Design a protein around this ligand. Structure first.
Ligand SMILES: CCC1=C(C)/C(=C/C2=NC(=C\c3[nH]c(/C=C4\NC(=O)[C@H](C)[C@H]4CC)c(C)c3CCC(=O)O)/C(CCC(=O)O)=C2C)NC1=O
Ligand SMILES: CCC1=C(C)/C(=C/C2=NC(=C\c3[nH]c(/C=C4\NC(=O)[C@H](C)[C@H]4CC)c(C)c3CCC(=O)O)/C(CCC(=O)O)=C2C)NC1=O
Ligand SMILES: CCC1=C(C)/C(=C/C2=NC(=C\c3[nH]c(/C=C4\NC(=O)[C@H](C)[C@H]4CC)c(C)c3CCC(=O)O)/C(CCC(=O)O)=C2C)NC1=O
Ligand SMILES: CCC1=C(C)/C(=C/C2=NC(=C\c3[nH]c(/C=C4\NC(=O)[C@H](C)[C@H]4CC)c(C)c3CCC(=O)O)/C(CCC(=O)O)=C2C)NC1=O
Ligand SMILES: CCC1=C(C)/C(=C/C2=NC(=C\c3[nH]c(/C=C4\NC(=O)[C@H](C)[C@H]4CC)c(C)c3CCC(=O)O)/C(CCC(=O)O)=C2C)NC1=O
Ligand SMILES: CCC1=C(C)/C(=C/C2=NC(=C\c3[nH]c(/C=C4\NC(=O)[C@H](C)[C@H]4CC)c(C)c3CCC(=O)O)/C(CCC(=O)O)=C2C)NC1=O
Ligand SMILES: CCC1=C(C)/C(=C/C2=NC(=C\c3[nH]c(/C=C4\NC(=O)[C@H](C)[C@H]4CC)c(C)c3CCC(=O)O)/C(CCC(=O)O)=C2C)NC1=O
Ligand SMILES: CCC1=C(C)/C(=C/C2=NC(=C\c3[nH]c(/C=C4\NC(=O)[C@H](C)[C@H]4CC)c(C)c3CCC(=O)O)/C(CCC(=O)O)=C2C)NC1=O
Ligand SMILES: CCC1=C(C)/C(=C/C2=NC(=C\c3[nH]c(/C=C4\NC(=O)[C@H](C)[C@H]4CC)c(C)c3CCC(=O)O)/C(CCC(=O)O)=C2C)NC1=O
Lengths: 277, 66, 160, 162, 162, 162, 162, 160, 160, 160
């Protein structure tokens, strides 16, 4: 009907004929010479998403979710391979997070689950009780703080030696040591200055509170804190939240408390760790 | 006005916990001036009693250098 | 397991296992033979232990199997004894593992909410676990009795 | 989260128009059903534990393999997580009924729930069956009209999962 | 796509180098295993429908929720889609085993598949369990070495879906 | 994480069965090799820096372009990142060897490692070659009985990246 | 991030090459443009509030639907969000102009902005119009010579959004 | 560079560059031409500089080229001189950049890790850096000598 | 000042000052004579600059002086000119310091809430500082006028 | 010591010592006399162990005692042997204590900073302690040799 036997096909974009509205953005992504550069299908996904609830996704898109690895801050890029799924996630949408520990200690059902007794499902907890004024626990706590804040130990030139000394000497608490690490120039270099602002906010939130953000209330609050006060403002505000105070006081290093289903899938779905039928 | 020396007593009113926490209740620590308003507020939230506060590093009433 | 806990402690600190941790693993693997013997003895006697503990409990707490009781009837009594068998198997798992971790994962985390949803009394469970400990420790040797009773008392405290 | 009143307020703010007779009519209808909603919510709150008990008993009787070894609810941990999820569904259905709007379900319950359960391994169909059993239990306690009201939210959850 | 020989050729071509002893050793290894690969591919092609039958039976017997109402595989159309996905996994595992490289697996299966299942609501864990079922069913028919070789690519698919 | 003992415990718990003869045989097989595992872990811990030395030197001798300008390991920072990644691989291979299981490799190392390296531009083949080099260097130090044990976990990591 | 000096340095570092005549020519070009860049940066810092003032007013005058009810900029919250985004755009364009490179724009702004705006429902055509508003508003304040320099960074932002 | 450091120090607190930072950038862009001249004079004469610096280093520390030493042998000595060439190239990069930044990322982060993985003695590296500094300052005038000396001093202190 | 900022930035990582910070301090101390002559010129003509700045404000913003405004009345106008005096003194402080830290922590930190507590419009403040900039730059020499202008622009951006 | 390790683990987990680490304490106190006899057997052989280890170290690393090296000269070689004396005494302390705790707390914490202050190469230290391990294991039977080698190679890894 459109082309017949003797006519070469052409792109039937705007002005040539009536344009559908339900596939507008995807279609005009397709009528682009960069369409082969995208390998993820976009129309089956779109037409499936029209008929299903919101996904488990960062409110600013799937490219805002870092891989839940030990260290690195790896994000999807819009440009190397588009693979971008936008979702109409509202401001009151609360993300569904999975506990790294006892399932019924989730804050959604148990508001006191943060102060609940630790099971063997939970990670190792590092607390500094040494005289708070020869001890290997202090060095263990220091290493755990580096492993949580940065995901890994730093090189010798990069250590916050003065803060460490204040830590075994008792002038500062574990919370102040974590603050000195997270506000350090090395942390700013590694996780702030090379990333999209909300990507940095999400990653830093995961390193400091041990959980992804719940939605646009938290992300918008820390986004405005970025706007007003910068990296130090964001980091100090995250550490100054009450939630930090109930889960990590002055004595305990932060630990991972929540994961996303994608981060759980990274570990559980590997061929070794899949539950055998 | 740089560093405060604060000693306080923070009893526990929400739980009874069996680890060692003598260091958490009574403690003397150094708090920054910019941190001290929030620290004092947080201590008062928890029902703690503030015993003494002293200026340590900086000099009181400095129009500059703070 | 002892090995799992040592590895997890070393990994949390991003370090290799220390001589003390390797010493703990060495002692654990040395004792593995007698712990397997204890677990196998406890396994071969499952029917006798479960039966004797069930009769001891029901005679000690008749209200559970009386009409209006939680375990009244053949099917509910069978479910009672089947929970007892679950916990006996979990104790054997703890015996082989070297610690109470299998017990905790499989039957201690969330136990109170589950039995609260089942209307199952917790004092009844505690006394049933105590009866199981008495029967099992009575059947097996005195030296192994302390090792087995450690896990049994852990379970009794957990359900209490 | 938006109730019927908030929905009217937003649909009039987007237009920029003030309230006229139709908005007052919709608000009046919501206040007309408000007493039924409050009584149903109070009854459900008074008997939440009971409702969870018969609903879980019915689900595990109909599907015994769930609580047997190799089932997703075979552990004290996983059984507790299961009854916790059932409590979630009941409580948020009560919220949605009390608000008169299914927004809270999409907003706090059904978002990313399929991906979460699929990553956990939770059977979706059995969760829907638990929701339907919970519906049947709740209806008898709340009465005919309140059951018809709660049914739309329970069916909303079941269709969102399935 | 890319196979083992093309892999070595590309690695040496990017460097601009001629083939040396290590490259010739890799080529000789592939040529040694070629006959085993061909036998395994023929055996699989002869028995593909069978392997799909036992793998699907295993998966839907251990997880009957998938095929009851409300499940992802509940309809004739969705059941057929599931068995078609398993058929494609098996065929491309055979292709990768013949080629000796997992490049075709990436390009023709794993690029965009997890996003597609995330949109569709497909439980990827159950898909991986079905892939593992196909692995064990295939190994028995193909023998020890062919089973190890095929399991390499089955595990590659399973970890790629992760 | 999951070790050999916990693997057996879980595979029997999911069945609902007590330990049978096969279970006790598996437990005996694990306990018999404990002394070898502990001795090898001690040797590797005491010689980790030497192993990283020799593996890095071998890898950058076979592929000197990695540490020369334009190479992925060309800077002090990126060379440090390379040797740090190698140290991580050695440490986790030692953990997997003590455990008797490859689970910790899947849930602390290989989860998203391939996609992370693809994002960073890290050459996967060169990293696999470095893992192999660590394998030969460790096999000399630990001894044949422990060399075979370390080999399976090094090969597991190599197949995870590959 | 990266500026012109660092760009040349990195190019010659990856080549392992030495600073030749071309490199020193590029360095001379940047040093020649430096004083103009610094003057423009200071001027824009002085008048940043004024630039946002005028650009917002003009954008909302050309497209008044944004600020009327039902518009993306209709609320105090959404209007303040629009102003905050424009203030970022001005500040980061100033950073890129002073650096002489658009790498900072890419990594800090454009990597993830399209998907954020598409998920938020933010119109991208109107955002590009606002960027062009800031462009020709700041062009008057900085002067023709500095306008020609800041315009390329404003067009870079616009092309990244479009 | 100076521009990069000022921009990141501005961005971290979400502000435009202060008058001091703009004045610093002005000084840098005003000194750019003499910086390029210094980069010239170091660049053309570097075969010399490397040879004299290596000779002076091996004279003052004969142990490195004595049997059992790190740089013993022609090839390891060649690697030594290659490292010296690396670091002097980094020094010219720093001179053009106006900061020790390119030096810092390219050859200071993890340098202790790398020279431990090679067991290159860091005191030998520091001595080589002082030798290169002396040789290079010999070929520059006082104003250029001081500027190149600051970068060499940073490198030597960083390796120390 | 510049020295204070460099010292605190270096001590943040507990390290000696980089050649970049040493170079910025050297440029700061090198230009001390010109900035101190600028301080001379500004402090000698305080009343003139303040008067013309007030006149330019009042003609540009007749709103403030008209009845019902913040500056209506003789006393409130006196407070206006007094604040202009404060701010030009702070500008001189920043010029001699070489950094805006004295301006920051004397007249910028908390200024928003402060002029909120005084019902003082911040657009009025930016108009005031722009008038001050124009009057001062009119009197200063070509090179010095720019240096004064950058501090005045910092103050303008700081207020609003 | 082992007792200290058990007590601190118990205190960190906030409970009494379990029968497992009680058995650990019993086994440690049961083996004390063997540890003491091993400590002697090392103690009479101070000079032979230390001098053989130094000879092997300077056989592998002639550069160390070559002119310009760290141990060049009689006095510096004496300081070498005295450091080996310290570490042999620490190994004896560790054998007696049952774990490596005295070894780190006296000679491993801060050793890198100390030897960097002393220009002492860490590879030389690890070669020296490996030589001491090889010498000291020969003096003992296999059962004693294994445990002593555990302390020695822990020390070698810590120095590396
Ligand atoms: C079946 C569902 C469907 C819808 C609804 C739809 C809307 C639609 N409206 C369009 C154009 C348009 N639509 C409008 C209408 C607006 N102008 C304003 O003044 C008014 C508020 C309003 C009219 C009441 C206008 C003016 C255009 C022309 C835009 C242009 O070309 O500049 C276009 C692009 C031209 C084309 O059709 O090929 C689409 C796709 N398309 C669909 O497939
Ligand atoms: C491991 C070392 C350690 C010790 C020793 C210790 C003692 C201790 N007891 C406390 C409270 C308390 N302690 C007591 C006990 C007293 N009541 C009287 O009847 C008795 C004479 C006496 C006990 C025999 C009471 C009643 C409180 C509650 C505070 C109050 O209301 O007065 C508190 C502070 C609040 C809290 O429990 O968080 C501490 C720190 N804490 C430690 O970490
Ligand atoms: C491996 C971890 C695990 C445990 C422990 C477990 C217990 C458990 N016991 C159950 C039933 C039951 N359990 C009991 C046992 C009680 N009767 C008496 O009161 C005693 C106090 C007590 C036993 C000593 C009874 C009577 C029932 C029947 C409840 C009913 O059908 O109404 C059920 C409900 C599902 C079913 O009947 O199969 C569970 C899940 N399930 C698990 O996956
Ligand atoms: C209010 C919105 C919301 C929902 C719905 C929700 C569900 C939910 N259920 C979970 C676990 C679970 N959920 C279940 C329930 C299943 N067991 C049986 O198969 C049943 C068919 C079925 C329930 C009727 C089980 C067994 C787990 C444990 C999974 C595991 O530990 O592996 C988890 C992960 C652990 C955690 O709680 O953090 C979530 C997030 N979470 C939320 O924030
Ligand atoms: C631009 C940043 C950068 C640097 C600096 C760098 C240095 C570097 N030096 C190396 C080897 C070496 N480096 C030296 C230098 C030492 N010899 C003496 O001990 C002296 C104290 C000292 C020199 C003054 C030697 C002798 C070797 C050879 C070691 C061997 O034979 O294995 C290697 C191993 C691979 C190779 O030789 O190409 C690297 C990567 N790589 C980089 O990407
Ligand atoms: C514990 C689990 C885990 C691993 C293993 C991991 C790998 C990892 N390696 C990285 C960098 C790197 N890794 C390497 C190493 C590779 N490139 C060389 O050519 C070699 C062939 C090869 C090693 C044998 C290099 C060179 C870099 C620097 C790349 C860069 O920073 O851009 C990074 C970037 C973050 C950072 O450097 O701080 C990650 C995340 N991340 C994890 O969470
Ligand atoms: C529903 C929430 C909402 C509000 C309230 C709102 C206020 C609002 N006030 C505006 C301008 C204005 N607003 C005012 C009112 C002020 N003049 C005097 O100083 C008084 C103190 C004060 C009124 C009592 C004036 C005079 C303007 C015009 C300024 C201009 O055109 O530049 C504009 C810009 C109109 C445009 O760009 O087309 C908006 C959007 N916007 C919203 O989305
Ligand atoms: C530094 C890099 C960066 C940028 C730029 C960025 C943009 C950004 N803009 C946002 C909101 C917004 N942005 C705008 C602005 C647009 N709408 C108007 O019509 C204009 C045409 C246009 C601006 C000129 C609006 C109106 C919102 C509010 C959206 C909403 O609340 O739903 C939000 C989400 C705030 C929230 O959670 O509610 C982000 C993250 N994020 C970043 O990390
Ligand atoms: C019990 C814990 C402890 C240790 C270990 C320790 C080591 C130590 N070694 C020192 C000197 C020294 N140590 C050495 C030995 C090194 N030279 C190299 O060739 C060898 C690889 C290596 C020995 C195996 C040398 C040569 C010196 C003299 C360096 C100098 O004075 O410049 C010194 C300075 C005091 C002196 O000169 O006598 C100390 C404190 N001190 C302690 O309190």
């Amino acid at each position: 009907r459109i082309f017949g036997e003797d006519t070469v096909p052409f792109i039937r974009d705007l002005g040539q004929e009536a344009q559908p509205s339900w596939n507008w953005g995807a279609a005009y992504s397709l009528y682009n010479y960069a369409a082969p550069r995208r390998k993820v299908p976009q129309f089956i996904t779109l037409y499936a998403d029209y008929v299903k609830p919101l996904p488990n996704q960062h409110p600013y898109g799937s490219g805002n979710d870092p891989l839940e690895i030990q260290f690195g801050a790896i994000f999807k890029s819009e440009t190397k391979a588009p693979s971008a799924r936008p979702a109409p996630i509202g401001k009151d949408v609360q993300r569904i997070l999975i506990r790294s520990g006892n399932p019924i200690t989730n804050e959604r059902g148990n508001p006191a689950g943060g102060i609940s007794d630790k099971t063997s499902l939970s990670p190792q907890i590092f607390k500094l009780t040494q005289d708070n004024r020869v001890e290997v626990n202090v060095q263990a706590v220091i290493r755990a703080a580096y492993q949580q804040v940065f995901g890994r130990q730093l090189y010798e030139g990069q250590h916050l030696s003065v803060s460490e000394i204040k830590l075994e000497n008792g002038e500062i608490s574990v919370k102040e040591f974590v603050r000195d690490l997270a506000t350090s120039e090395i942390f700013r270099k590694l996780y702030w200055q090379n990333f999209y602002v909300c990507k940095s906010i999400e990653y830093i939130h995961r390193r400091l509170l041990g959980r992804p953000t719940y939605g646009r209330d938290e992300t918008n609050r820390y986004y405005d804190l970025a706007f007003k006060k910068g990296f130090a403002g964001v980091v100090n505000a995250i550490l100054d939240t009450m939630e930090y105070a109930e889960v990590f006081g002055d004595d305990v290093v932060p630990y991972e408390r929540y994961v996303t289903p994608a981060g759980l899938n990274l570990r559980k779905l590997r061929a070794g760790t899949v539950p055998t039928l | 006005t740089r560093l405060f020396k604060v000693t306080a007593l923070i009893p526990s009113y929400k739980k009874v916990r069996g680890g060692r926490e003598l260091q958490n209740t009574y403690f003397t620590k150094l708090v920054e001036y910019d941190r001290w308003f929030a620290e004092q507020q947080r201590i008062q939230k928890q029902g703690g009693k503030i015993l003494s506060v002293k200026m340590v590093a900086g000099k009181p009433g400095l129009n500059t250098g703070v | 397991s002892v090995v799992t806990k040592a590895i997890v402690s070393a990994d949390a600190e991003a370090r290799y296992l220390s001589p003390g941790e390797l010493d703990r693993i060495r002692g654990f693997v040395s004792s593995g033979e007698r712990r397997l013997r204890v677990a196998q003895t406890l396994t071969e006697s499952r029917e006798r232990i479960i039966k004797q503990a069930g009769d001891q409990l029901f005679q000690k707490r008749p209200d559970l199997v009386s009409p209006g009781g939680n375990a009244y009837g053949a099917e509910r009594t069978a479910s009672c004894l089947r929970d007892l068998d679950y916990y006996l198997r979990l104790v054997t798992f703890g015996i082989v593992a070297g610690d109470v971790t299998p017990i905790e994962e499989i039957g201690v985390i969330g136990v109170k909410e589950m039995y609260r949803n089942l209307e199952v009394p917790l004092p009844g469970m505690v006394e049933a676990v105590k009866a199981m400990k008495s029967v099992a420790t009575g059947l097996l040797s005195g030296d192994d009795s302390a090792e087995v009773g450690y896990y049994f008392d852990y379970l009794a405290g957990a359900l209490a | 989260m938006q109730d019927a009143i908030t929905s009217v307020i937003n649909t009039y703010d987007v237009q920029g128009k003030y309230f006229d007779t139709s908005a007052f009519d919709k608000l009046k209808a919501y206040y007309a059903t408000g007493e039924l909603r409050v009584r149903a919510a109070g009854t459900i709150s008074a008997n939440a534990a009971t409702i969870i008990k018969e609903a879980s008993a019915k689900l595990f009787s109909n599907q015994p393999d769930l609580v047997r070894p190799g089932g997703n609810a075979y552990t004290t941990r996983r059984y507790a997580a299961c009854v916790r999820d059932m409590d979630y569904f009941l409580r948020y259905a009560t919220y949605a009924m009390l608000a008169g709007d299914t927004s809270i379900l999409d907003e706090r319950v059904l978002n990313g729930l399929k991906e979460t359960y699929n990553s956990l391994g939770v059977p979706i169909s059995s969760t829907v069956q638990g929701i339907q059993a919970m519906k049947e239990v709740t209806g008898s306690l709340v009465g005919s009209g309140a059951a018809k009201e709660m049914g739309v939210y329970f069916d909303y959850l079941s269709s969102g999962l399935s």
